[model samples]
Target: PRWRGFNLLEAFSIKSTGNFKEEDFLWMAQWDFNFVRIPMCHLLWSDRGNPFIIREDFFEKIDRVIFWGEKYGIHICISLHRAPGYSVNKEVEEKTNLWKDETAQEAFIHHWSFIARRYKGISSTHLSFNLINEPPFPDPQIMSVEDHNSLIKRTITEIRKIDPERLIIIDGLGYGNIPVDDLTIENTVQSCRGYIPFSVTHYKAEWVDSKDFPVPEWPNGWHFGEYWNREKLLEHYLTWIKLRQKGIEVFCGEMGAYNKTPHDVVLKWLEDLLEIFKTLNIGFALWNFRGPFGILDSERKDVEYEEWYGHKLDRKMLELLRKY
Candidate 1:
């Protein structure tokens, strides 16, 4: 299942979109994507109002996903996307900065320990834990890669005390894309993201500054003279290859072309990108199976719609993916 799939924010958010159903896992398995990266927010488990209380209903939502995961023969890789101390999307307003807070560090370790104890007997084949979503902040004062490495090592030590055999995954330093040469933790794997050309993958998106982003042409220059194609992909992956040489498993846990680009252009990017992934034998999970980056119901105007079950299916995109 290491040849995988990923990131459903609906199933992972603090205020979840709704209950995650068996249909979600079944759909992935049906598509031959046997692995899933479940990005979770810690606040969903711990109390926001009371501080440390774990919600019963929240835990059950996760449990149901895992239960269906096994039933559907899907491998679930669990990770904390939004943590008590770190949020990849914004500044730490909810609590102390995770990098500096000793209390936050202990809280994070305890959270992992609690999860490890809960799923102790589960096979690593069926499940795994990725430490935190992204250990970021490029500046050394905020937190260096070295500091993040040390933090991971400490968390790894706590996890080994109970669940000694579960596979551990650690996202890289720069928003989970830049792979470091030294992670040095035992029983660990690594993951990185895609969206190399943010402009292309996130075309016309409301969140990004449209002014800074070029119109996202494939391979080379349309407006911006920067090259973001095969060569760029190779350069980005070279660091990860260094880790692979160290007897570590590397995964591209999150990668996708957002829905705004032309469907044909998106397919072109995905073709080369997917080829690179398959060529390296790296296990990958697209940003999603539905929603914006989705294969089915992609809502791309370039792609004609075909109905599947209830949701509109982008069968053309799915077939394009299957071709490569």
Candidate 2:
């Protein structure tokens, strides 16, 4: 139920990205919003002088945002944040290596079986396949957790041999959903992140080391002793809300606050984690749409640029994220 909205950072690679603008998926269904998470870039269909040469039919901008998120109802996941190997961005890990590179894990599971046979049967309620966005790294931060869950059990058994009812998320481990194998795939979901005090959601984050990140304050005591309140955001999501009480559909795909920190302490830590994500019904997206942890092109020179609809907005963090 948390397919809320926005992560459209216009594909971060093919030479550092530029895409967006289908009026950004038509104003994300004209602002009532349902979804979006594109984060993209397997070197934008690879072959930048051979990054394992994929060319998934030259990817036509991830097929015009799955044809503009099915002409704007929204729901589109397609994340590979820069897969085909380790990269929390070590210059895209010197270009491809899906941990121990056997041709970068068979060209990353044959480019997810050529994008699940090019969007086969399309409808786990309109597209989903987040198989690679935030894969973890350890042991010199390369790969572990049984080699990234045996490379996520071989890319969910090659995207269920040609898209068996699609909908598959799986970005845990170092990316933080915590519990891993409970993967009973009935069109699985499970994605997480709220940037818990990463020196206040990466504050002064010019790619970290912003004078050793400090300034942050919410329900109180932050910076590693870590306690931004609301029961430490429900104890940093008690194992993805106990894997959503075991039915397993959990998400928080990426949470916000990093426009250089204090927008009234990022609206008191985003109203106590958006009221525990609408009282644990748990469905979220908010890590983009405009810049620095966005809400609407959040330039954040200490906010104050009201007038929403016609652009310059931040209308108090966009009406405090449209009120809850």
Candidate 3:
């Protein structure tokens, strides 16, 4: 199924402890979306002092999300955005590295297996597990490809031991931009990212480098000698196409431009990417359902917003996404 939807961030970070809102799922289903990725932080449910200790109360918060997804007929993908030892956002430090420390690896496997066992009866059509947010780019000093692959293999084995019917997804290396062509697991899907040409997607985003960035323009932009255009964008995504050719199911787990990029450029770039995704039969989930990079309350300066249910809506962006 070419699932299309948005990511819900209610539990994406350690500080985020609120329950996933029912309205988000309600609105997504209303908009004809059928998937939602709940990127989570391990600290939200586990103890940092003793990683082995279980927290049932925190687990119920996630269970509610699964319940709502089932009620709305949306497929739910649970992802460890900030796992025991790794996270794309370094908001909290891990006691040990996920790739090197046995304890951290144990905790990581334990969390996934526990969740699998908890939701053992759920069908794969409605629920899936994304092992981790984004495995770091291969760095021999930090984690070699062999180490990453080994951990993934071990983790998947543990989960299948408890629930063999569950679907699993692995994010690409290099912040989800590169494919994991070496993985041999069955009943698993590979996830790719869509934030290529960082200048456009992350313009003035403070998380990345604070250096001045050139104003983003689609179809005629340049960065480090690589031109930004629809053709180049397709060229970039072709790596995932090659992975698909190898018989691996692929999905764009996260994609969107931050609010700083000009609205026109965002829509143009998005249309091209969405067209390619549709042509290739690849599913996608935007980085968020609300807030910056989303269709709701994005706070983009150049957009003429529409009032919807007391929230600002980017009607043009929403319509563009819906068209795909």
Which candidate leads in lDDT?
A: 3
Superposed model 1: Cα runs more than 4 Å off: 49-51, 221-225
Any residue pairs clashing in model 2, and if so which? 2-283, 85-98
TM-scores of the models, in the order given: 0.92, 0.32, 0.96
Worst 10 residues of 3 by lDDT: 219-228
Please list the residue runs of candidate 2 whose C-alpha ends up more than 4 Å from where it truly belongs after superposition: 1-5, 8-26, 29-35, 38-75, 78-126, 140-146, 153-155, 158-201, 204-211, 214-257, 261-286, 290-292, 297-301, 309-324
Query: What local lDDT score does residue 23 receive in model 1, on the 0 to 100 scale?
Result: 80
| Superposition error at 35 for model 3 (Å) | 0.6
Model 1 alpha-carbon miss at residue 245, Å: 1.5
Model 3 CA lDDT for position 294: 94
lDDT of 1 by residue, 169-232 (tens): 8888877787767775666789888777776788886755555667667876232335677877
Tens digits of per-residue lDDT, candidate 2, 1-324, equal 568887887776667554567886786577677888877777766754465577655566677878888888888988777766645655444455576667777777877888888889678787898877666644535676777777777888888877667878887777654656546566688788777766667777776565755667776636555456778778777657787566678887888877878788888778788788878767788887777788776777887786656666676765666666
User: In the order shown, what is each candidate's alpha-carbon RMSD?
Assistant: 2.3, 17.8, 1.5
TM-score quality measure for candidate 1: 0.92
Error of 3 at 218 (Å): 0.9
- Each prediction's Cα lDDT score? 0.75, 0.73, 0.86
Top candidate by TM-score: 3
Error of 3 at 316 (Å): 0.9
lDDT of 3 by residue, 142-181 (tens): 8889999999999999999999888999999988988997
* RMSD over all Cα atoms, model 2: 17.8
